[PDB]
Amino acid sequence: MKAYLGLYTARLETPARSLKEKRALIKPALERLKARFPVSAARLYGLDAWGYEVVGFTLLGNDPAWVEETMRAAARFLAEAGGFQVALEEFRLEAFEL
């Protein structure tokens, strides 16, 4: 029996000019993402910058098709948040034996 993990990562571009303005664009969208989808989200790199950031989210399930479909729906949702653009993205699916 395997545990399946989806890992989504993306480069966001924002029009911000301060770290506080940038957080106000990104954090509320990630909080909405967490409320709507069963994911763990994180701000990963570029945290010293105002205009770009690498973020991601992951999720776990026992059905790889459900994990992937949910991950792609959550990614579409993130691109619809506005405030920032999803400039580049990557999807991954890993399986772990239990």
Task: Give CA–CA dist 74/3, Å, rounded.
Answer: 19
The domain in which residue 96 lies consists of: 1-98
Spatial distance between the Cα atoms of 98 and 91, rounded to a whole number of angstroms: 23
CATH number, residue 70: 3.30.70.1120
Burial 23-38 (b: 16+ CB within 10 A, else e): eebbeebbeebeeebe
Residue with tokens 């709507």, as numbered in its chain: 36
Hey, what long-range contacts does 23-26 have (CB within 8 A, 24 or more apart)? 25/83, 25/84, 26/53, 26/55, 26/83, 26/84
Contact of 40 with 58, CB cutoff 8 Å: yes
Determined by X-ray
Q: How far is CA 61 from the centre of its chain?
A: 17
The number of domains in the chain is 1
Stated resolution in angstroms: 1.7
The Cα 66–Cα 71 span in angstroms is 8
- Number of Cβ within 10 Å of residue 11's Cβ equals 16
